[PDB]
Amino acid sequence: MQLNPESADLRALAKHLYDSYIKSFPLTKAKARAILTGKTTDKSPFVIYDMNSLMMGEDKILQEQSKEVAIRIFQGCQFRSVEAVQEITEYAKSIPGFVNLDLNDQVTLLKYGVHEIIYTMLASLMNKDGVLISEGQGFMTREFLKSLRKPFGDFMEPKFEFAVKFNALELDDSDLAIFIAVIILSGDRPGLLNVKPIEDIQDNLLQALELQLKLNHPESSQLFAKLLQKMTDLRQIVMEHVQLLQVIKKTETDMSLHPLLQEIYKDLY
Amino acid sequence: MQLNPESADLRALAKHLYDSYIKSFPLTKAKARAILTGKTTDKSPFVIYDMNSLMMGEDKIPLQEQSKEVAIRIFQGCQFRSVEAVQEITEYAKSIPGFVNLDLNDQVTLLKYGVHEIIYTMLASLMNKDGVLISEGQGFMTREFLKSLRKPFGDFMEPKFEFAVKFNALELDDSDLAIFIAVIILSGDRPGLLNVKPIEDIQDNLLQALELQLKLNHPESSQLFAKLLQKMTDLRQIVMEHVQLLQVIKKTETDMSLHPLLQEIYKDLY
């Protein structure tokens, strides 16, 4: 490793991705950690730890029902998911060379990868106790999400399980900006014609990420390998999610989905 | 990259894994590629490209519907080998430095989730754009023939062929495969394990060994380490779509049994 024009360019590529990551995503890992440790005073979130804390929290964010509780939560998860797909698309277009690829392959790269990004970025909002909700305005506890009516008391546990392992790597927004870009640009997704120009964009991004982690994480040896193996855990989560979603469409027929999400989930896994 | 005691040890770890890989697996990539390119002069396999080539081929290896009878036998022969393969992988796993000293419940666990990932990584060595070597180089079944089989069997081999194409383009050899296989086995993030600390401790070395092997052996391929690691993603997807498909053949066909060794592996998996 040395200071040469190629290394200087890999840093330039890294800065670019970071600046566009900041421009695309409003709730950054730095921003969310600050809240999660109480370093901010403006963003003091309400904690939803039970039913009585949820009903009071709905005032900020029939006679009696617990079914309406699991329905309302799940709908709000897909409410944010749609807003998130918009940001990821805005971001994807800023990756050097993405636009100049086949548009039918741009559609493809975003179709399979959007969910992997969603969950990578969701871990930034999480801790062993719970998740930040409503752009940092609320905090829903892990155990509360777990107590929800079957089979909803299981749709968030794999994300929390992942989040714990991922967060132990101690990555920052500068590292996440390259990693997110790496995930998008993959030459092993189905329905791709031009894998050659994609694998060349990713080769640069991987070269950029390897250097970023070398400079930023002197302590973590084999982090590059560790971070790359998390893409395996992300695919499993995306797969177990669509597998769980088929149970919602079947067992509880009266549970609709947004047409933007309906197109993504169609003919996926 | 430098020559120091740690690097010398990583090479020793690499040699060890290769020598046990050779001892465990009889049909190596080198061996299979020679058959596939007609460089061997004895192992001349019979090509099964349709129905008539299969019947004549069955002479070399039920009044029911022909298309159903043929799909059933093929699918059974895929699992007959799969069993023989699990035995080889287990023999290999025991040779990885530190595997035996771990928890035996964790040893059972690691092999439970990883055996299928290895099976498919090693299956790609027997494959080319045209088909797959069957019965240890005695036969060659075509991709398109496997694709024509009665629903939903005409779909169980396509993901393996798709993978194989991408994996083989990396141009790995038995030395590289020997470390990669070992890396897959020592996966930390699997269910039913509490001793993640010693498991990760083994994989960190294996990964360090693989990074050096690819650096020395593949001077041309600059991000081969990153590329090869991303294939573990494709392997998990295949193992997942496989168990998901296996569910269909039991619900569709009541008269479709499985070997008790495989029955234990697939149980409570994905």
Numbering used by the authors:
A (entry chain B): 230 to 290, 298 to 505
B (entry chain A): 230 to 290, 297 to 505
Task: Give excerpts from the publication.
PPARγ (peroxisome proliferator-activated receptor gamma) is a transcription factor of the nuclear receptor family that functions predominantly as a heterodimer with RXRα. PPARγ is a key regulator of glucose homeostasis and adipogenesis. The recruitment of coactivators by PPARγ is primarily determined by the interaction of coactivator LXXLL motifs with the receptor LBD. Helix 12 is key regulatory structural element in the activation function 2 interacting with coregulators.
The PPARγ T475M LBD mutant was crystallized in its apo form and in complex with GW1929 and the PGC1α coactivator peptide. In both functional states, PPARγ T475M crystallized as a homodimer. PPARγ T475M, localized at the dimer interface, exhibits an increase by 2-fold of the binding affinity to RXRα compared to PPARγ WT, as a consequence of a slower dissociation rate of the dimer. Comparison of PPARγ T475M/PGC1α to PPARγ WT/PGC1α RFUs revealed that different regions of the T475M mutant presented a significant lower deuterium uptake, including H2, H2′, N-terminal H3, H6, N-terminal H8, helix H10, and the H12 helix. These regions are thus more protected from deuterium exchange for PPARγ T475M compared to PPARγ WT, which might be in favor of a decreased conformational flexibility of PPARγ T475M compared to PPARγ WT, in agreement with MD simulation data.
